[PDB]
Design an enzyme around this catalytic site. Structure first.
Site, PDB file in Angstrom:
ATOM      1  N   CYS A  53      42.757  17.991  51.857  1.00 14.85           N
ATOM      2  CA  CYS A  53      41.461  18.626  51.656  1.00 14.85           C
ATOM      3  C   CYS A  53      41.155  19.728  52.662  1.00 14.85           C
ATOM      4  O   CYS A  53      40.790  20.836  52.264  1.00 14.85           O
ATOM      5  CB  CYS A  53      40.351  17.565  51.708  1.00 14.85           C
ATOM      6  SG  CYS A  53      40.576  16.194  50.555  1.00 14.85           S
ATOM      7  N   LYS A  95      30.770  22.602  48.491  1.00 17.23           N
ATOM      8  CA  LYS A  95      31.941  21.736  48.570  1.00 17.23           C
ATOM      9  C   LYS A  95      32.981  22.310  49.525  1.00 17.23           C
ATOM     10  O   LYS A  95      33.504  21.600  50.391  1.00 17.23           O
ATOM     11  CB  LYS A  95      32.534  21.534  47.174  1.00 17.23           C
ATOM     12  CG  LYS A  95      33.792  20.680  47.151  1.00 17.23           C
ATOM     13  CD  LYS A  95      33.551  19.330  47.803  1.00 17.23           C
ATOM     14  CE  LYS A  95      34.834  18.526  47.925  1.00 17.23           C
ATOM     15  NZ  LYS A  95      34.599  17.229  48.616  1.00 17.23           N
ATOM     16  N   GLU A 140      32.738  16.510  43.741  1.00 16.09           N
ATOM     17  CA  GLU A 140      32.866  15.147  44.229  1.00 16.09           C
ATOM     18  C   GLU A 140      33.127  15.153  45.728  1.00 16.09           C
ATOM     19  O   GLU A 140      33.837  16.021  46.243  1.00 16.09           O
ATOM     20  CB  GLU A 140      33.988  14.409  43.500  1.00 16.09           C
ATOM     21  CG  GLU A 140      33.958  12.913  43.727  1.00 16.09           C
ATOM     22  CD  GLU A 140      32.634  12.286  43.324  1.00 16.09           C
ATOM     23  OE1 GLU A 140      32.415  12.088  42.111  1.00 16.09           O
ATOM     24  OE2 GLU A 140      31.812  12.000  44.220  1.00 16.09           O
TER      25      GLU A 140
END
Lengths: 458, 460, 457
Positions: free
Chosen positions: B275, B219, B160
């Site tokens: 993140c 990712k 995601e």
């Protein structure tokens, strides 16, 4: 103040095309390009220009003799000029402090001293070539120390962002025009006068005015950021070979994020050319000189990663050939630092070839554009015994153990590899250092070729 | 294969909004979101959702009860599902090998064992949360070792890319949808089945299919590249202060090159959030585990530069206050890692505040959105009680202060009455703009009498 | 399948003696030794063999012409052979990756390509010379990439364990015969076929069959373990000089433990020869290439200790002569890496001599067996001015400040040291680097020497 006469000192690939475009888009402005090579100046006034750039001949001949002139009378051109461009090359220092990384300002200093000796009244002096940060302060110091009554020299930074082969396209439609000057009111007058020149064909929104130091730094930083993108994706390519990931899939997925962008995300054996490594190394030296070791070692990684990518690729070749390539014929396809040029400066092909020559390999080198003499010089301080320059790729691959693709020439995609495989020694290896054979790996493996490439697991 | 029933294990910040959008754009697909927190599931089935996201309530209530369901019966949802999403969080390991950098796969492994026990027939199992590279190999190993007759589980990677506060916008108009699966023919069938789900509202051109390992790596790499851009411009900001260059001028000049782009070139005291650092560090650990030290130390520089930017900014503050800030009142404006959020995870404000607390400063901290308790916890392991005060308005924090430190780019800080602030500040009065939010005010501030220092500009 | 025709490529000190013994103990097996050196093959067919090995002449002449043959027709010998031995030399790489430590497989690769080009049908190809680990994988890759219809080549590892001077004794009564092959059924058939050859004179219990990788590693590991024992006892010798212990007493006490053994526990200035350092360095390089730095630095200590022992011994000599030996005459007794040979490869005498030459010493070198030219080449302007090669030990010691015993020749024990001491400059030193003067120290001290030796304070 209106700029009506422009003198560019240095008729090279920066001073020439840039002032040619200025005279093209500014018919009222007289533009004189001066240089020290009588061969260059004569060539500039000849039907064959001393440098090939698409559209340059069309641009120059439509302006040469009308408002664009080439001459060797530097003193006279300087005296009459309202704007003096300094476009001499700043080569890397060969000895002393900052050897190999610092820029050698001797030509800029010589140019500045010549300008101040032949200048009276108000003039704008503009650095066009890539200079180290704070170099304009050295020019101003020379101007201050050699001042004359009523002599007012303003120093500006206007770094060039043109690329070989597309200089005219980049000059006519620049991404941005960068002009740096002092925040003092007099400096702003000089900045606007140079802005008014670019405004003849460059939209005002793309003309960015900064201080002098920001303008000098932006030129270095832009090339460092670009080199960093390549080193970053190259670092991922090593990881992809370790994990089973594919660097092209990762790069495509990365580049679809609009914040990252999809340009300069092609993994390769290493970036080359005369700008990337030189600018990063100059950035590193600048940081070390300014007591910023953390920044220095940060940007040193871009160079270290690029070197590691070349060494790793060469080590894969050597390891694939049983850690012995003595007397082994290896075909090197492509010697230019990129496709569609004859330029070999900092080409990864040089370093890959040197590593294989260190192991005693017999290199048969083909490049469709790099002349034979350039290859010898680049590999020369051994070359006579180990290096052969082939006329065609099939000559280089005949009886070879490995085919090493170091430049992304389009013709290499279209070679008759089945023909190549028949005459190669077995096992026959192809090392694609540019990912140009993607989509052919199935055919090559069926032919019987062990195909190894950057950023794909074996 | 036609996916008709979807089960998402994990009703959190990823599993919730993602499956809500799927049920919105795929009315004919039954979507069940399961979790272990009964409060979460009850909240999901309540008028106040357990997470605030713009448009989420409109999306969820339009689908909840029709084809979107929230439940705690994980076993039943797993059994009926054709596609099972794994959206459990993978926290960083707290101990052992890879402490602080490696991801802890215990929840994914527990989820995989739960799935294989309650699964019969053909199913597609998809990793949605950020996983370390090769994690799907561990799921496949668990599935292989616990196989049943006629049980065929296909493992896919579908990481995601949503951002908090704008997840719905990112889900409905994604830059790209990344799906990774085996290059084997069976894996490709699973990939196309998941692609057909996204094709209800995502153009096929933006759906990128790769192998599983490329999808997992992409990712991590995307966040590493973004963090690298920030660290790179921050490194230039240090150089700008040394040379007289201005980082904002350089960044503008850099970003006008279309090959570089103008996004993520804002110099700051350091990047934050949950993140960037986590993924870079996971990337570094992965490289070390794969005998790639050159790559590891390459990406470690992104973290090292970010740490250096914070330490340098704190050291400027301390040096500006005579290398002594003991008992000195310092106003910290902004504690969130970025403006317009209450999130403090890896906020540069934390590290700047800790450095000043190490020097005994009395910090008066104001943030318009970060609640008081979060600030205390982040600064806490005595020291917080004695040294930290949480102000309710910026003027309260700046009253009698020696320095005003702006650590978050809140828009209100641009509009503060600094002349009022300057009157009650101790002299000399310093402003340290760690976000470049006071640019264009430096002339006014200096006339007021404010020693204004900021990132990427030489001290005037 | 029964092996009846054997071809050995490489007529050196491995391929020659080994196949000579095979033809001796297997009269019904045809054994052809092939090589490029025309002089070697001619010498092998001459009454003077190209290498001296005790018992080799009787073995060779008893078989040459019956079932042992030497030839230069490599292609013809390969084609008819049922078993092909690869016994070419694998020298250390001189440049590139692994310079000085990695083995250069160019000859083995050239041999493998030669074999596959001239081979039809079933054959067994066997590495006899010391190869790096995984070398047989490269041979198999060459064979796989150059395959022919019905061509079936099996690759085996059969490392040699013979020592120069006692090769024939070691071949006829080996401690063990090591054969490595693939664990696949086809490989086991090749392994048994070679085992059946050795079983003509080697008991089955002493023939150890392993996989190919284990066989290649065991050869390296055995030499590394041997070198380690020497380095370990040499490390103790430095400790003994610092403590007042005697390394010979410690070594005797250590070796009486049956688990340790009393062999290879003699302290010395350093181990030499063409095997020990080469094997350890190849082991270290192998570990580094396999991402095992802990193992690499573990085995690097064997070499580092050996280098330290030489440097320390040279530094003691220099320190004893007032840290100045410029123009000082120093007698070097013994230049071979061990007694009873002319071999100087990696001799500690070379390194001790170079250290003394770096200080400008005038070295007078005597060795009863090493020829004069070899000494000059090993030490090779500096050799011309500083090195003199003496005819006899008394010539080397005449007017010398120090006598350095670097090789354990038995004659040095019997020299007339009182005669030596009279013509030596005083103070006169004897540096016994081999403990060969033990028991003479009392006599030497009464003569007037300052006697210093390894592992004694």
């Amino acid at each position: 103040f209106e700029i009506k006469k422009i003198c560019c000192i240095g008729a090279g690939y920066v001073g020439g095309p840039t002032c040619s475009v200025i005279a093209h888009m500014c018919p009222e402005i007289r533009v004189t390009v001066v240089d020290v090579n009588e061969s260059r100046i004569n060539a500039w006034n000849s039907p064959t220009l001393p440098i090939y750039e698409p559209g340059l001949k069309e641009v120059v001949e439509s302006c040469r003799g009308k408002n664009l002139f080439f001459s060797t009378n530097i003193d006279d051109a300087i005296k009459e000029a309202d704007l003096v461009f300094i476009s001499v090359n700043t080569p890397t220092k060969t000895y002393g402090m900052g050897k190999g990384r610092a820029a050698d300002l001797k030509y800029i200093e010589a140019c500045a001293r010549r300008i101040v000796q032949n200048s009276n009244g108000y003039k704008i002096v503009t650095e066009k070539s890539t200079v180290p940060v704070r170099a304009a302060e050295s020019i101003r110091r020379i101007f201050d120390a050699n001042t004359k009554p009523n002599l007012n020299l303003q120093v500006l930074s206007n770094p060039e962002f043109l690329a070989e082969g597309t200089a005219i396209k980049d000059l006519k439609n620049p991404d941005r025009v960068l002009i740096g000057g002092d925040e003092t009111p007099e400096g702003q007058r000089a900045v606007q006068a140079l802005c008014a020149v670019y405004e003849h064909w460059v939209p005002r929104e793309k003309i960015l005015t900064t201080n002098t130091w920001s303008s000098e730094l932006s030129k270095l930083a832009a090339n460092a950021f670009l080199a960093q993108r390549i080193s970053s994706i190259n670092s991922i390519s090593a990881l992809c070979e370790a994990t089973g990931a594919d660097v092209e899939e990762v790069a495509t997925a990365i580049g679809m994020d609009q914040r990252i962008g999809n340009k300069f995300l092609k993994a390769s054996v290493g970036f080359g050319g005369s700008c990337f490594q030189k600018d990063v190394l100059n950035l590193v030296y600048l940081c070390e000189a300014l007591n910023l070791p953390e920044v220095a070692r940060y940007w040193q990684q871009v160079i270290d990663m690029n070197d590691y990518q070349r060494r790793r690729f060469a080590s894969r070749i050597i390891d694939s050939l049983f850690n012995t390539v003595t007397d082994k014929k290896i075909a090197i396809l492509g010697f230019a630092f990129k496709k569609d040029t004859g330029d070999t400066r900092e080409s990864s092909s040089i370093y890959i070839s040197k590593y294989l020559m260190d192991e005693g390999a017999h290199l048969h080198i083909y490049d469709p554009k790099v002349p034979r003499e350039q290859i010898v010089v680049d590999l020369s301080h051994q070359v006579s015994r180990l290096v052969t320059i082939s006329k065609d790729p099939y000559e280089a691959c005949d009886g070879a153990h490995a085919v090493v693709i170091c430049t992304e020439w389009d013709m290499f995609k279209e070679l008759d590899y089945e023909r190549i495989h028949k005459k190669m020694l077995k096992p026959a290896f192809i090392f694609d250092g540019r990912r140009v054979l993607d989509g052919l790996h199935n055919e090559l493996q069926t032919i019987g070729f062990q195909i190894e490439t950057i950023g794909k697991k074996v």
